[PDB]
């Protein structure tokens, strides 16, 4: 199958930015793409097919161009309106369509570090047998943040799950809370929880950790 | 709008509908593209005008797309599903009539396909306690693990409305156990922990559960 790979995973823009989007094919297509525009909650939106044709309507401050594997999508000036998440699509084969993995334009801002806090679980839910570790992200810009958990030095993998806000509609932040989740037979034999995060805003990667006894 | 989702068990069958009116379904490519909770558009399989029927690798053998030209209606389905099968829905064409074959300009609403075994069942409400490990420049963090629910919604208020500045409720993920879980958080001044109290209000009307839950500050 084809694999298209957008980037960037979050362009930052601004109203009267001229904003352009970069979808690459992992087999050539000839200009057998389409572009999409989705809101949140929403249907997805024909823009742009055989790489530069508008579907009719569609404003003409969007444009398209590239044949072959690599393609841009270019939003002249961007409009209040243009905040959204971007699609590409190939279809040079009749048999398999495959999508970009999206690209969501934002609110720029300026870079903000997220503040990383963690709490064990509480004594309350370890008498149900369970024992859920939370690591919060708070207020950080742009969204692409990694975290990672390990317990006792352990790359936890499969246990967890990530949730993110949407951008906050006044400070323009991002917010996200991992859980990691163990059984209270296990997490009672093990001794440090720790919560690594990756983020542009800082130097190098940050470490939130407790040891299970201590409070 | 689609139809024939909602909730299904894994091993169980759904059958989706897409009945259109705009156009006739039979003279032009009909498609089904789905896209799980916070993930993007994948392409599932597609019907064109002279019946010929391809499918994704992911859904090869347990999917059938076919549609009735009587009713003007597309159809999936869906067989031996899964719970990676969890996903929005949309039926798919073009209204255009050019010599393409592939883009879409006819999108319907979507629908919910939730994949679970689970029964319905109140959350357990846990307190996300503030404490140093909470606390920046004179601002702790605090909040209500809500855990292991089904179905959804949950709401979540903190101190029965009077506080919402500063509340992240963060949105519901499904477990791989089939089970709901969502965090709502709340950054209040540190002064504040010793001389005020913090509760987060959980109701889930499914199970007529509703929690109040006191989120008491750690001395560490």
């Known amino acids: 199958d084809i694999q298209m790979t957008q980037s960037p995973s979050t362009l930052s823009a601004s109203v009267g930015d001229r904003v352009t989007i970069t979808c690459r094919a992992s087999?050539?297509?000839?200009?057998?793409l389409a572009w999409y525009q989705q809101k949140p909650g929403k249907a997805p939106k024909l823009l742009i097919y055989?790489?530069?044709s508008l579907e009719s309507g569609v404003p003409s401050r969007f444009s398209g161009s590239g044949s072959g594997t690599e393609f841009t999508l270019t939003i002249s000036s961007l409009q209040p309106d243009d905040f959204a998440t971007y699609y590409c699509?190939?279809?040079?084969?009749?048999?398999?369509?495959?999508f970009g993995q999206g690209t969501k334009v934002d609110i720029k801002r300026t870079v903000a570090a997220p503040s990383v806090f963690i709490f064990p679980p509480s004594d309350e839910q370890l008498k149900s047998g369970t024992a859920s570790v939370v690591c919060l992200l708070n207020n950080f810009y742009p969204r692409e943040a990694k975290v990672q958990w390990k317990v006792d030095n352990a790359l936890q993998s499969g246990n967890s799950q990530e949730s993110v806000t949407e951008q906050d509609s006044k400070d323009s932040t991002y917010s996200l809370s991992s859980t990691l989740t163990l059984s209270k037979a296990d997490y009672e034999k093990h001794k440090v929880y720790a919560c690594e995060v990756t983020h542009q805003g800082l130097s190098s990667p940050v470490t939130k950790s407790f040891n299970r006894g201590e409070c | 709008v689609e139809s024939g989702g909602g909730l299904i068990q894994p091993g169980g069958s759904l059958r989706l509908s897409c009945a259109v009116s705009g156009f006739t379904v039979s003279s032009k490519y009909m498609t089904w593209v789905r896209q799980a909770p916070g993930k993007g558009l994948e392409w599932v399989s597609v019907?064109?005008?002279?019946?010929?029927?391809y499918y994704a690798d992911s859904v090869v053998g347990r999917f059938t797309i076919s549609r009735d030209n009587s009713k003007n209606t597309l159809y999936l389905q869906m067989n031996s599903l899964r719970a990676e099968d969890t996903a929005v829905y949309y039926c798919?064409?073009?209204?255009?009539?050019?010599?393409?074959?592939?883009?879409?300009?006819?999108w319907g609403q979507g629908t919910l396909v939730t994949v679970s075994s689970a029964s319905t069942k109140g959350p357990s409400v846990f307190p996300l306690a503030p404490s140093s490990k909470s606390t920046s420049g004179g601002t702790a963090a605090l909040g209500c693990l809500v855990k292991d629910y089904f179905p959804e919604p949950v709401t979540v208020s903190w101190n029965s409305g009077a506080l919402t500045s500063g509340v992240h409720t963060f949105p519901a993920v499904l477990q791989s156990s089939g089970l709901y879980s969502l965090s709502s958080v709340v950054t209040v001044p540190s002064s504040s922990l010793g001389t005020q109290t913090y509760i987060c209000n959980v109701n889930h009307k499914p199970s007529n559960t509703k929690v109040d839950k006191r989120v008491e500050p750690k001395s560490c």
């Open positions: 087999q050539s297509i000839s200009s057998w």
């Open positions: 798919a064409s073009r209204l255009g009539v050019r010599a393409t074959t592939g883009d879409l300009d006819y």
């Open positions: 699509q190939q279809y040079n084969t009749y048999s398999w369509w495959t």
């Open positions: 055989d790489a530069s």
């Open positions: 019907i064109y005008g002279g019946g010929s029927t």
